Structure formats: C-alpha cells, structure tokens
Amino acid sequence: KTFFGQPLGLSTLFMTEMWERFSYYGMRAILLYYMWFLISTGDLHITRATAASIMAIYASMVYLSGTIGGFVADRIIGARPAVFWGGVLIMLGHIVLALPFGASALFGSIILIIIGTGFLKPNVSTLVGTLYDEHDRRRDAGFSIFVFGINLGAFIAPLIVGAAQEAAGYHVAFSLAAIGMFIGLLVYYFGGKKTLDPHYLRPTDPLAPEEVKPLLVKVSLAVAGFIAIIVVMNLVGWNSLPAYINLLTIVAIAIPVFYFAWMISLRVVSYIPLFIAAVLFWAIEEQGSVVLATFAAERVDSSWFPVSWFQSLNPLFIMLYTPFFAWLWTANQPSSPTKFAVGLMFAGLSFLLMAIPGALYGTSGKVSPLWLVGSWALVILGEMLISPVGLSVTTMMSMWFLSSSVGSALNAQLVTLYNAKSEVAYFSYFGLGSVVLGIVLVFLS
Ligand SMILES: CCCCCCC/C=C/CCCCCC(=O)OC[C@@H](O)CO
Ligand SMILES: CCCCCCC/C=C\CCCCCC(=O)OC[C@@H](O)CO
Ligand SMILES: CCCCCCC/C=C\CCCCCC(=O)OC[C@@H](O)CO
Ligand SMILES: CCCCCCC/C=C\CCCCCC(=O)OC[C@@H](O)CO
Ligand SMILES: CCCCCCC/C=C\CCCCCC(=O)OC[C@H](O)CO
Ligand SMILES: CCCCCCC/C=C\CCCCCC(=O)OC[C@H](O)CO
Ligand SMILES: CCCCCCC/C=C\CCCCCC(=O)OC[C@H](O)CO
Ligand SMILES: CCCCCCC/C=C\CCCCCC(=O)OC[C@H](O)CO
Ligand SMILES: CCCCCCC/C=C\CCCCCC(=O)OC[C@H](O)CO
C-alpha cells in the first residue's frame, strides 16, 4: 500500500504543501485588488504604482527568507518544528488581514508570512527527501508528485478565494486563506506523528559550542548595519515607502552581486549569463500576479467571473505541460544553457504577444481573456525549460534559489512603469529586450 508508489508519509507532506500554497496564492490573487480598494476609500495613502511595487518586493522577500529557513532548521530548531511554526505564522498573517482593520494591518501580515514561509517552504521539501533512503530510485517520482500537490493548491485557491471575495468581501476571503493553512497544520501535525522520523524533531547539524558566539555576532552586525542605514535614510529625508522599497531592492540584488565578486576573487564566470537569464525569466513570470493582474482587471471583458481567477492559469499550464515534458526528456537532447536561452525567449514572446491588442485595438477598450491565456501559455512553456534545469546547471546552489528573489526585486522597480498609457511600450520594450538576450545566450551557449 502506497501513495502513488511512494511511502505513505508523502500523503501528509503532499497535503501540507497543497494547503499552504492554497493560502499563499489565494492571498496573492486578491491582495493587489485589496490594496486598490483601500486606496479608493482613502484608507491607504499610496498610488497603484506603489501598490504594484509592494506585491513585487513582498514576493522578493518571501523567496529571500526561503534561502535562510533551511539553515535555521538544520542548525537550530529542527525541520519538523520549522514547518509547524512556519505554518502557524503564515496562518496568523492571514488572520491579521481577516480582522476588522484596513491598511494598518498590511505590514504585520506581510512580515508574518515572509518569516513563516521562510520556515516552512524550504523544510517541507527537505522532509520529502527524508522519506527515502540514499538508495531509493523512487525519489524523482516522489518529488514530481509533491510538486503536483503544490501546483494543485496554487490552482484552486484563486478560484475559491476569488469567488469568496466576490460573494462575502475581502475579510472573509482572507479568512479562507487562513483556514486553508490551518487545515494544512491539522493534517501535518497528526499525520506527521504517524509517518515522520522523530530524528527531524531536532536539528541534524546543531551548533557546536564554539559556533554559537560568532553566529550571534554575524547576525548582530547585519541587523545593526541595516538599522543604521534606515536611521541615515530618515535623517537625510529618504523616508517614503518607495524609498524603503528601493532599499530592499538594493539589498536583494547586492547579495548575489557580492557572493559572485567574493567567489570570483573560473567557470563561475560562465554561470553569470545563466543567472542573468534566470533573474529576467523570473521577473517576467512574476509579473503575472502584478502587471497581468492589472491588465486582467482593467483591459479584459471579465464581467461574468472574478478577475482573480486568471491567476489559476499559471499552475494550470504547469500541470498540463508537465506530463508532456516528462515524456519529451525521455525521448540529441539540447544543452542546459540552450534551455535557458529558449526559456527566456518564450518569456519575451509572452510580453510581445500582450503588446498586440493595444496596438491593434487601442488601450481604452476591453479585449478577449484569450490574450492572457496565450500569454501565460507562452511564459509557462519557458518555465518547463528553465526551472527543472536551473538547479542542475548551477551544480551557488543558493544562487539558483535567489534568482527568483532578484527578479521580483527588479520587478519592484519595473512595474511602476506600467499603466494604460504605457501599456504597449512596456510590453514591446521588455518583451523584445528578453528575446534579444536569449538570442545572445544562444551565441554564448
Ligand atoms: C502554447 C502556445 C500558445 C500561444 C498563444 C497564442 C495564441 C492565441 C493568442 C491570443 C488570441 C487572440 C484573441 C482571440 C479573440 O477571440 O479575440 C476576440 C476579440 O474580443 C479580441 O479583443
Ligand atoms: C485556531 C485558529 C484557526 C482558525 C482560523 C481563523 C479564521 C476563523 C474565522 C474567520 C472569520 C471571518 C471574519 C468575518 C468578518 O470579518 O466579516 C467581514 C465583514 O466585513 C463582512 O462583510
Ligand atoms: C552584503 C550585501 C548587502 C550590502 C548592501 C549595500 C548597500 C546598502 C544600502 C545602501 C542603499 C541606500 C538607500 C537608497 C534609498 O533608500 O534611496 C531612496 C530615495 O531615492 C527615494 O526617496
Ligand atoms: C528577423 C529575423 C530573425 C532571424 C534570426 C535567426 C538567427 C538566430 C541565431 C543565429 C546564430 C545561430 C546560433 C546557433 C548556435 O548554437 O551557436 C552558433 C553560433 O554562434 C554561430 O555563429
Ligand atoms: C492553550 C493554548 C495554546 C495552544 C497552542 C500552542 C501549540 C500546541 C502544541 C505545540 C506543538 C509543537 C509542534 C512542533 C513540531 O515539530 O510538530 C511537528 C509534528 O510532530 C509533525 O512533524
Ligand atoms: C529560530 C530562533 C531564532 C534563532 C536565531 C538567533 C541567532 C543567533 C545565535 C544562535 C542561537 C541558537 C541557540 C541555541 C544553540 O545553538 O546553543 C546550543 C548549542 O547547540 C550547543 O552548544
Ligand atoms: C499545436 C500547437 C498549436 C498552437 C500554436 C501556437 C501559435 C503561435 C502563434 C499564433 C499567432 C500570434 C498571435 C496573434 C493573434 O492572436 O492574432 C489574432 C487576431 O489578432 C485576433 O483578433
Ligand atoms: C510568427 C508570427 C505570429 C503572428 C504575429 C505577427 C505580428 C504581430 C503583431 C504585429 C503588429 C500588430 C499591430 C500593428 C499596428 O498596431 O500598426 C500600427 C498602426 O500604425 C497604429 O496607428
Ligand atoms: C507565438 C508568437 C508570439 C507573438 C509575438 C509577435 C508580436 C510581437 C510584437 C507585437 C507588437 C509590436 C509593437 C506594436 C506597437 O508598439 O505599435 C504602436 C502602437 O500603435 C502604439 O502604442
């Protein structure tokens, strides 16, 4: 008796991640529209450009937090508690938004989820490997099944949450996200005790006595320096929300900039164009929940259904393409930098495609939802070529997990350029921009 030929414990982690991704992407599907709403009532004193920038940097921090959660679990708290307490903080983040508050709750919600996802996201995948011996040939299948559960949650969430927001408002919809995470915790907690190794209740590589102090010092210097920067910023008058957002953008981009300059000082050099292509691809893919969400709400005949449902197309196409590419890579298979190149080209085509309706019809009307369907089909096609390979090429493993954070940080700057007047230029310029760089990468391949 198995779960698709895998140890029964996979069923627990499958559901755990399905519900967490439900909570996360359910929130993402309506958070931007929610900020627009708070703005329209005068409760939130920012522009839509800033709100769009917030969504991008929010994403950026979540991915950044993810590069740290594995360490904290491996060295300090253990993978099993990390997942649990991460789940708790994620649940509380969605509760904060469900409470009878407005803009005052946004920061607290954002922080809780950044930290919680940081503890949960890397460590659930770790525990999946825990199910198998070193020997097990079933590993690749088990992770594929796990990924399917991730995509499932991401798929149903905007449908269910978006419908709920339409029927019962934002606060109820945010509560559904919280309940989703809660369900994830129930199944995880009770299902875990039956199936998970008690070894992972504790860290597997705990700090040795002599490691405690320098780690505390290292963490301390970072906080003091970051706090110092913020003090100076407020002294010299750089203290607006766009300013803090720029600071985090700089931070998110500096980290890979430093580790490279650190490590360089020589095939690492060859990894640079790969890393650049990854950042750019993630930038475009992550604009689906920001720029494309804006386009869906302003430029699409979506009178008969919640416009947040467009967020379901991303994981839908992942699920549709997946068994195909599963087959395709079994049946000369192109190289890895070739995949990145063609992978970035498809991202570029997805934005080039979106420039068409504005150029043909104008930007003051509404167009068919099919334009967005086509756009997402194109970008996810690019994801099938880049994501399954990116970790393999880089084998700096962290560099791979950071490419998504840098793309989002870059987006935090770029998405402020998008509006009805700049629609066609935005899509053409960046669409073509990414296509040419994918052409360059073929030359450098
Ligand atoms: C996996 C590869 C797929 C590539 C996607 C490209 C195919 C479709 C592109 C967009 C279709 C155009 C819209 C069709 C339509 O019914 O237009 C009606 C009109 O209301 C438009 O405003
Ligand atoms: C152990 C805790 C787990 C449970 C998760 C927390 C969620 C439980 C109940 C959520 C109640 C929804 C909020 C109701 C509400 O504010 O109504 C909004 C009002 O504006 C109606 O339009
Ligand atoms: C080890 C990697 C991290 C190192 C970070 C390097 C530099 C950190 C901070 C410096 C950036 C200055 C802040 C910029 C800023 O807030 O400008 C805002 C202003 O233009 C808007 O009103
Ligand atoms: C408007 C028309 C655009 C047509 C574009 C066609 C050309 C695209 C790429 C040209 C070079 C081939 C790349 C093949 C390759 O893998 O490397 C070899 C290349 O470096 C040859 O010099
Ligand atoms: C009286 C109100 C407060 C009660 C709620 C607080 C939380 C209750 C129990 C905490 C349990 C800690 C879980 C840590 C953990 O590793 O869980 C993992 C599971 O064992 C499965 O892996
Ligand atoms: C998730 C909780 C927050 C931890 C971050 C604080 C980082 C700074 C110093 C590390 C604190 C670790 C405390 C426990 C510890 O490692 O000491 C005992 C050693 O295992 C044995 O000497
Ligand atoms: C077996 C695969 C089938 C799909 C093939 C992919 C199609 C590739 C390019 C299609 C054409 C480019 C989009 C332009 C477009 O939508 O024009 C349509 C009219 O403008 C609609 O009013
Ligand atoms: C592989 C080919 C797939 C099919 C797409 C081919 C080209 C797609 C779009 C080209 C431009 C579409 C609109 C043209 C346009 O807006 O003309 C500009 C007018 O002068 C506006 O005043
Ligand atoms: C699978 C095919 C993918 C589709 C890509 C083909 C189309 C590429 C670019 C189309 C749009 C080009 C720019 C149009 C443009 O800016 O014209 C000016 C407008 O009239 C004013 O904004």
Author numbering: 6 to 270, 280 to 345, 349 to 412, 423 to 472
Extract from the study:
To address this question, we determined high-resolution crystal structures of a bacterial homologue to the mammalian PepT1 protein from Streptococcus thermophilus, PepTSt in complex with physiologically relevant di- and tripeptides in addition to a peptide-free apo form. The POT/PTR family contains a number of conserved sequence motifs and a conserved architecture consisting of 12 or 14 transmembrane α-helices arranged into N (H1–6)- and C-terminal (H7–12) bundles 3,10–12. A centrally located peptide-binding site is highly conserved between prokaryote and eukaryote members, with both operating via similar transport mechanisms. Conserved pairs of salt bridge interactions coordinate structural rearrangements that lead to the vectorial co-transport of peptides and protons across the membrane 3,11.
Comparing the structures of PepTSt in the peptide-bound states with a high-resolution peptide-free apo state determined to 2.35 Å reveals that the Ala-Phe complex assumes a more compact structure. The movement appears localized to the C-terminal bundle and occurs following intra-helical bending at residues Ser431 (H11), Asn328 (H8) and to a lesser extent at Asn156 (H5), the latter two side chains making direct H-bond interactions with the Ala-Phe peptide. The cytoplasmic ends of H10 and H11 form an intracellular gate with a hinge region located around Gly407 (H10) and Trp427 (H11) 3. C Zoomed in view of H11 showing the formation of the hydrophobic pocket around the phenylalanine side chain of the Ala-Phe peptide (coloured helices) and the dissolution of the pocket upon adopting the more open structure observed in the Apo structure (grey).
